[PDB]
Ligand binder design. Structure first.
Ligand SMILES: Nc1ncnc2c1ncn2[C@@H]1O[C@H](COP(=O)(O)OP(=O)(O)O)[C@@H](O)[C@H]1O
Ligand SMILES: Nc1ncnc2c1ncn2[C@@H]1O[C@H](COP(=O)(O)OP(=O)(O)O)[C@@H](O)[C@H]1O
Ligand SMILES: [Mg+2]
Lengths: 411, 167, 377, 314, 178, 123
């Protein structure tokens, strides 16, 4: 009968695949593509030239991350698709090999990062409508799906249709204010830090401190210590002193296996336990030209929103995406915000002589178990609804108007 | 019918006369500076359109103006397959118009590609090498389409082999 | 100047640029940005032999700004930093600019209309209780553009860095209830310009680079005359894409952002501001004036301040007024519009007309005491 | 070919100091640079930077030593050397579109600005305001005015235009100037009367010049044509069409010879004879001017162009 | 943004050039008075050092910041010597000979921050701040030498020598002119 | 909605010379009658068709003598007719007009073409 629409979330770290109406994605796969590298013998003078069926000799996902004779490429960068040649191939095997959905009769929900240039929406619709032959497509704003995932999962009676959603994927962090289900797009701010920058900062810091990690596995170990040993610290200068004095308890051994010799190797894990995710609060570490802490940006977003909605937003700050999963992350963000807002009120008592005391503001930062796939889940619930088939761009629309139907966006 | 050398030479001598552009601030808005061939808002600054064609299907239209010239050209889609392959080639060239500084992002209606040269391009770029690029495009375009037709035929044959050989 | 030999300085204390000089001048003697900065060390920018003093102000604080953290001491018409602003005046009357013995001078100041009263109070305070001027007068920015134009009636569209005002004046009578603010002006367009270039992939995100994008804006932006034409032209052809070199020689390409940013004056919802654009706000101001003043006001729309300088603003503004008059007064009687006499006074000297008005008024008034506040009362 | 590349970018105008020791140029921006002939090599000595948009014409008054500039910002400014630094004077130009050309009058009491506003502004000093004020020539000019030249009597002004027609106008400013003598163009010459109209109908008229006797105007057009109207044949006009690209600027060098230049990037001589009334291609970029000997008997002339740089010829 | 800034700018404390002559709790000879509180400017620098080197923008509040920054620049230099030292005894002897070398002073060429420090004009300025900066160096090196060497083996410890590469906002007190 | 308001706005001689074989004069005979002034459209299409008959029926080796017989006025007229025939393609016509172009260009140069582009009264 009626076949479920497909949901594809083209993350910068992990693409997430499945069909509408499921509580989980059917596949989580790293958004990389392995291509045959032997062309590099000729390709010394110019980029690899394809002939025959050589461009079908590629692998994606876990089939591609450690193959011995293929060069892994990472097509997506800051959420944007940077090499459409490789992404177009990546889509082919996603649809036909993994999902095994014939595109001709499945609607697609395909996610977008809020920073996406209009030109890149034209290309993505053009590939889905014209390289494939999708009957209808909907480019959906990741942040709204993340909020709805929390809305539909969280306890009844606290299902507020308003919140500030912080989405930190692997590429970029977005802070999106929502009121009554409408995105206040004017007030969006972007923080140019995410999982990659945390990984690279650990990767650099290990390569200063701990030579002996083989370069091929330098990225693997930086990723592993990040996900397993790192935490958001309470106070930086004091933490260094804690590590210097009680190093016997704070320094942790990590043991790795050599990809080639299969000898074991081991390292101390140290300051890069709390350094790393600290770059959210001190972006100047990883990024030369950004300096506002996340707990500063979030308040500037809310305090630009209409005066009525500001108080509702502080009650429902939603964390989303895997880079928000560090231990104690939300606890510190709340503390920094609370220290910022209560002082803002206290000033307005003195500038009013204490004749009236303002009601406090209840900064609350909320977290939920979907966070590895929350955007996808929010899409799969949307795509189950009958309204989705009314909202989608129908293929006939792309016949009457070109790619230009996908110029627009929430901003 | 007509050979390629006369056709290109007639185009070159025509286009060589049309690139005598000048800087010219517009009369219709306070101090905007815009190519008259595209805004067309005053008509004593537009030159007479001229056309050069070697047969009933391959034609070059030159539309001059005091500060800009638009060159729009059509190429023979001799086969059903060539219409598809030519459209894609033009689309992917036109998709990069910020790099081809003299290229429009959409064709002129009824032409396959269309260039727009401003006075600024004739001042910054070598004017004579812009003509040579239009001519070099016009020489090579059908050789390039022929190569695509062959390369698609080759792929179809190899894919057919990879199925049948398994039985 | 005075018969007492006292000079009469005119000092338009703008939120962007201080514009300064003497009575009777056809030009401001000095233009420099109302800017204050402190030295900062950065890892990226090199350090050299150009010494940065512990405080820098004005032109120097903008020219050296890469080594500085900079503040504007004044925002949206309001003094934020009574310390830094005193340093800005200390620079304005100091050796670098008007090297004046302030106790030998009369001064003419400007205030934006509808400003909060504690602002004027603190200004009048310091001009006696710190600089001790021989006399002080505060002049309204609306009438000064009329003096610079030589008129006695009009509606002033004053559009600075900080805020935009519409102010009718009829035969020298003020109509103060008709004064309308619009919360869009040149600083908001520059913040909006940043937010568009970030979408193209360029990050600026520093106080130093706030001034860099201003110089982009002034050089490259223009108000589109027929916004459907501008979007068609950008969609059809590459012509708009024009390249700018940052101070470090990075090259950036600026496209449709050239007109999408100034368009905030005509579709304020492109910024967060709820309201209507300068054209409709002006029209609704004149359609609130007393019935027979209205037909004079359409013949004397006067533009003032630097944010009016966008190429095509007078043409665009006059078209929007004709469209509204046909829609709302003539009720669609297209032929009747040919009688509608509308003039927008768009003199090339437009930017400084608030200052040139003060120069004219001070030149008229210099010996005519009973005008300046005096004896430090 | 004496040559020097000041800039790579188009030298959009130039004007020469009284003794040719200094040259004023636009470096393709809204600033004017003055260079002094520091021996064999040029050195920049001043940078006049008051304009708010690209300067489109410069002229330098040789007796009074004043520089007038106009631009697409709709400003004009008269620059006077106050001690050591050039300072501007306002022109109340009153035009609603770009200025395109400026020329001082031979008596330097007045100057004219051609513009996109379909008018010629005639400017003269108004000393009670310390600014310059305009009267507008207007009636038959249907499009923008591209180039101007003054009759040596400082009253008759010849103008070329995008509506294909060269014209002579009587710019007699009764406020500043004694009534002129009669001329072969006519005895009437109140302000703005139309003395002459071109027969042409096709190309834009890029350049216009008077002979040093004022009895002849020549113009050059986008048709790759030269014409010469002679007042003593009672305004009979010679024509010569040519095989090369259009000509952008022209000057007389004697009463019987012209030099012109165009998109062909080299100068061309056109002679004329008063007997048959025909131009002749004696043969061989953006504008031409005479360095020495004037329009009566030039000994050196110079050229600048969009291709950049300055060139001097004998 | 906010890197750590000096706490101890008492209004009683005299200035030379643009640097504050804070008291020092040192046995080395020098012109600043003897500190007696537990914290000291050299210990501020040494306590902050690990955190402070990561920040990439630094806004000078006062002359004490121009003083404390100089210490961190010198710590980021002493670590170069003592990482090579086989023993604490070698390092301590080495460090004494390091600090007495004639490092540039404000505005003398090769000094890294000529935009931000002004040269002392006179002998009683110049000689005294040399006599001050010398004893700062002497003390600063010795206080590192007490804590960078792990007491179990006099290994110059991995956790401190890790920082040798991480120059303080890319500024070297060695000076870029060499 | 304010934003959207539109506001502020011979043949009997030609075929005689051809049938006589006076082909060089048959070119002249066509060029005597330029309908430049005509407001009528169909007169222009007629005049262009008549001259095209001469250009096509000319022998290719004799085009050099034909063009060289014209004056500079005739050469500018010949170009204005050449660029017209290119807008009515036909199997033979384009091949000969591209040859007439090269010889008219050798006589008139690029300047003759500019006078086609600048011609304000379209023939
Ligand atoms: N337990 C964890 N703690 C911290 N980071 C994690 C954890 N698990 C995964 N991550 C990181 O989450 C990042 C982003 O993953 P994901 O949210 O799927 O990104 P996207 O959806 O934008 O592709 C990855 O860099 C991954 O390393
Ligand atoms: N050529 C220009 N075009 C558009 N805007 C301009 C131009 N020149 C200056 N501006 C803008 O003018 C403002 C300068 O402030 P100003 O006009 O002096 O207002 P105020 O006097 O109220 O400070 C700045 O916002 C600047 O960006
Ligand atoms: Mg102002």
């Amino acid at each position: 009968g009626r076949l479920p629409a497909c949901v594809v979330d083209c993350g910068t770290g992990y693409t997430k695949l499945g069909y509408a109406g499921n509580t989980e994605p059917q596949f989580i796969i790293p958004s990389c593509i392995a291509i045959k590298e032997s062309a590099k013998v000729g390709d010394q003078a110019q980029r690899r030239v394809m002939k025959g069926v050589d461009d079908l000799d590629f692998f994606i996902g876990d089939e591609a991350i450690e193959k011995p004779t293929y060069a892994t490429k990472w097509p997506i960068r800051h959420g944007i698709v940077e090499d459409w040649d490789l992404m177009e191939r990546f889509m082919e095997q996603v649809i036909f090999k993994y999902l095994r959905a014939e595109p001709e009769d499945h609607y697609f929900l395909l996610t977008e990062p809020p920073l996406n240039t209009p030109e890149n929406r034209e290309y993505t619709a053009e590939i889905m409508f014209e390289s494939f032959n999708v009957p209808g497509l909907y480019i959906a704003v990741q942040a709204v799906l993340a909020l709805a995932a929390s809305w539909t999962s969280r306890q009844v009676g606290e299902r507020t249709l308003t919140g500030t959603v912080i989405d930190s994927g692997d590429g970029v962090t977005h802070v999106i204010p929502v009121a009554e289900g409408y995105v206040i797009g004017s007030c969006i701010k972007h923080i140019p830090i995410a999982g990659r920058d945390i990984t690279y900062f650990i990767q650099q810091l290990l390569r200063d401190r701990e030579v002996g990690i083989p370069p091929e596995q330098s990225l693997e170990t930086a990723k592993a210590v990040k996900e397993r040993y790192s935490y958001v610290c309470p106070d930086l200068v004091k933490e260094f002193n804690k590590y210097d004095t009680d190093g016997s308890k704070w320094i942790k051994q990590y043991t790795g296996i050599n990809a080639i010799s299969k000898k074991e190797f081991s390292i101390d894990v140290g300051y890069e336990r709390f350094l790393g995710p600290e770059i959210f609060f001190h972006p100047e570490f990883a990024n030369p030209d950004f300096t506002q802490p996340i707990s500063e940006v979030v308040d500037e977003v809310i305090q630009n929103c209409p005066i009525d909605v500001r108080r509702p937003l502080y009650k429902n700050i939603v964390l989303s995406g895997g880079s928000t999963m560090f231990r104690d992350f939300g606890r510190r963000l709340q503390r920094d915000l609370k220290r910022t807002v209560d002082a803002r009120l206290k000033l307005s008592e003195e500038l009013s002589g204490g004749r009236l005391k303002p009601k406090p503001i209840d900064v609350q930062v909320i977290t939920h178990h979907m966070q590895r796939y929350a955007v996808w889940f929010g899409g799969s619930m949307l795509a189950s609804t009958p309204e989705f088939y009314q909202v989608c761009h129908t293929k006939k629309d792309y016949e009457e108007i070109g790619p230009s139907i996908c110029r627009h966006n929430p901003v | 019918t007509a050979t390629l050398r006369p056709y290109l030479s007639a185009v070159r001598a025509t286009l060589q006369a049309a690139l005598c552009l000048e800087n010219f601030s517009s009369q219709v808005v306070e101090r905007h500076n815009k190519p008259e061939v595209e805004v067309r808002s005053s008509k004593e600054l537009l030159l007479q359109p001229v056309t050069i064609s070697r047969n009933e299907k391959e034609k070059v239209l030159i539309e001059g103006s005091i500060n800009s010239v638009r060159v729009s050209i059509a190429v023979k889609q001799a086969d059903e397959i060539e219409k598809i392959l030519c459209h894609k080639f033009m689309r992917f060239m036109m998709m990069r118009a910020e790099n081809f500084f003299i290229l429009r992002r959409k064709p002129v209606e009824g032409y396959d590609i269309s260039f727009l040269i401003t006075n600024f391009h004739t001042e910054q770029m070598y004017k004579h090498k812009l003509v040579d690029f239009v001519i070099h495009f016009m020489e090579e375009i059908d050789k390039e389409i022929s190569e695509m037709k062959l390369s698609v035929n080759a792929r179809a044959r190899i894919v057919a082999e990879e199925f049948l050989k398994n039985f | 100047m005075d018969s007492q030999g006292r000079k009469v300085v005119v000092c338009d204390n703008g939120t962007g640029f201080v514009k300064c000089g003497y009575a009777g001048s056809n030009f401001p003697e000095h233009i420099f940005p109302a800017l204050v900065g402190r030295p900062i060390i950065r890892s990226t920018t090199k350090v050299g032999n150009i010494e940065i003093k512990d405080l820098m102000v004005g032109d120097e604080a903008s020219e050296l700004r890469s080594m500085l953290e900079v503040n504007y001491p004044m925002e949206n018409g309001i003094v934020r930093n009574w310390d830094d602003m005193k340093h800005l005046w200390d620079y304005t009357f100091g050796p670098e600019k008007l090297n004046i013995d302030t106790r030998n001078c009369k001064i003419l100041l400007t205030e934006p209309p509808m400003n909060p009263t504690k602002n004027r109070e603190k200004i009048v305070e310091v001009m006696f209780e710190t600089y001790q001027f021989s006399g002080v007068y505060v002049a309204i920015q609306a009438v000064l553009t009329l003096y610079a134009q030589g008129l006695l009636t009009g509606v002033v569209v004053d559009s600075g860095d900080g805020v935009t005002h519409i102010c009718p004046v009829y035969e020298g009578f003020s109509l103060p209830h008709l004064t309308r603010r619009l919360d869009i002006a040149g600083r908001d367009i520059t913040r909006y310009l940043i937010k568009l270039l970030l979408l193209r992939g360029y990050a600026f995100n520093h106080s130093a680079d706030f001034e860099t994008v201003r110089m982009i804006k002034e050089k490259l932006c223009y108000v589109g005359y027929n916004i459907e034409q501008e979007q068609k032209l950008a969609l059809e052809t590459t012509v708009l894409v024009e390249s700018y070199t940052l101070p470090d020689g990075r090259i950036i390409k600026v496209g449709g952002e050239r007109f999408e940013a100034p368009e905030a004056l005509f579709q304020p919802h492109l910024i967060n501001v709820e309201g209507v654009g300068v054209a409709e706000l002006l029209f609704n101001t004149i359609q609130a004036a007393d019935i027979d003043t209205r037909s004079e006001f359409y013949k004397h729309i006067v533009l003032s301040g630097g944010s009016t300088m966008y190429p095509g603003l007078p043409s665009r503004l006059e078209r929007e007024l004709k469209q509204l008059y046909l829609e709302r007064v003539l009720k669609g009687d297209v032929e009747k519009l040919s009688k509608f006499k509308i003039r927008i006074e768009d003199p090339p000297r437009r930017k400084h007309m608030v200052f040139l008005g003060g120069a004219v008024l001070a030149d008229i008034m210099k010996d005519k005491d009973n005008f300046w506040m005096t004896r430090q009362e | 070919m004496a040559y020097h590349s000041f800039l790579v970018e188009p030298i959009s105008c130039h004007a020469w100091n009284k003794d040719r020791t200094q040259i004023a140029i636009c470096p393709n921006n809204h600033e004017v640079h003055i260079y002094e002939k520091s021996g064999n090599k040029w050195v920049q000595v001043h940078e006049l930077k008051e304009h708010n948009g690209q300067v489109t014409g410069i002229d330098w008054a040789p007796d009074s030593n004043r520089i007038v500039t106009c631009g697409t910002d709709r400003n004009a400014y008269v620059w006077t050397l106050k001690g050591r630094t050039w300072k501007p004077t306002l022109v109340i130009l009153r035009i609603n579109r770009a200025a395109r050309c400026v020329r001082w009058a031979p008596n330097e009491k007045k100057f004219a600005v051609g513009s996109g506003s379909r008018v010629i502004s005639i400017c003269y000093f108004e000393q009670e305001n310390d600014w310059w004020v305009c009267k507008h020539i207007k009636k038959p000019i249907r499009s923008t005015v591209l180039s101007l030249d003054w009759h040596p009597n400082s009253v008759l002004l010849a103008a070329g235009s995008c509506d294909f027609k060269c014209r002579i106008f009587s710019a007699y400013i009764k406020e500043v100037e004694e009534r002129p003598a009669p001329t072969p163009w006519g005895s009437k010459m109140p302000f703005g009367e139309l003395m002459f109209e071109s027969s042409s109908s096709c190309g834009w008229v890029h350049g216009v010049c008077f002979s040093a006797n004022g009895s002849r105007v020549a113009w050059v057009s986008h048709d790759s044509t030269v014409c010469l109207a002679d007042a003593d044949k009672k305004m009979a006009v010679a024509t010569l069409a040519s095989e090369t690209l259009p000509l952008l600027a022209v000057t007389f060098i004697t009463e019987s010879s012209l030099v012109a230049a165009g998109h062909d990037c080299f100068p061309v001589l056109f002679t004329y004879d008063s007997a048959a009334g025909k131009l002749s291609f004696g043969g061989r970029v953006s504008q031409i001017s005479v360095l020495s000997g004037g329009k009566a008997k030039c000994s050196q002339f110079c050229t600048t162009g969009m291709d950049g740089g300055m060139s001097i010829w004998d | 943004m906010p890197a750590y800034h000096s706490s101890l700018m008492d209004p009683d404390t005299k200035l030379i050039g643009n640097m504050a002559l804070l008291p020092i709790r040192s046995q080395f000879k020098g012109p600043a008075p003897r500190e007696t509180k537990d914290t000291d400017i050299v210990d501020e620098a040494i306590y902050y050092f690990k955190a402070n080197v990561f920040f990439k923008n630094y806004e000078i509040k006062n002359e004490a910041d121009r003083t404390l920054i100089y210490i961190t620049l010198y710590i980021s230099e002493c670590l170069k010597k003592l990482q090579k030292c086989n023993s604490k005894s070698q390092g301590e002897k080495e460090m004494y000979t390091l600090g007495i070398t004639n490092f540039p002073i404000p505005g003398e060429p090769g000094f890294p921050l000529n935009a931000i420090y002004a040269k002392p004009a006179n002998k009683q300025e110049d000689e005294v701040m040399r006599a001050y900066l010398q004893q700062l160096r002497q003390e600063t090196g010795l206080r590192l030498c007490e804590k960078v060497f792990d007491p179990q083996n006099d290994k110059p410890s991995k956790w401190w020598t890790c920082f040798v590469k991480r120059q303080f906002m890319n500024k070297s007190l060695s000076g870029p002119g060499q | 909605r304010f934003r959207k308001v539109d506001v502020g706005e011979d043949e009997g001689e030609v075929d005689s010379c051809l049938r006589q074989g006076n082909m060089t004069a048959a070119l002249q005979a066509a060029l005597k009658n330029p309908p430049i002034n005509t407001k009528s459209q169909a007169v222009k299409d007629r005049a262009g068709s008549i001259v095209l008959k001469v250009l096509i029926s000319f022998k290719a080796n004799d085009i050099e003598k034909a063009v060289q017989s014209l004056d500079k006025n005739g050469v500018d007229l010949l170009m204005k007719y050449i660029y017209k025939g290119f807008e009515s393609p036909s199997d033979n016509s384009s091949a000969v007009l591209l040859q007439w172009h090269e010889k008219a260009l050798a006589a008139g140069g690029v300047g003759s073409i500019v006078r086609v582009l600048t011609a304000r009264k379209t023939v």
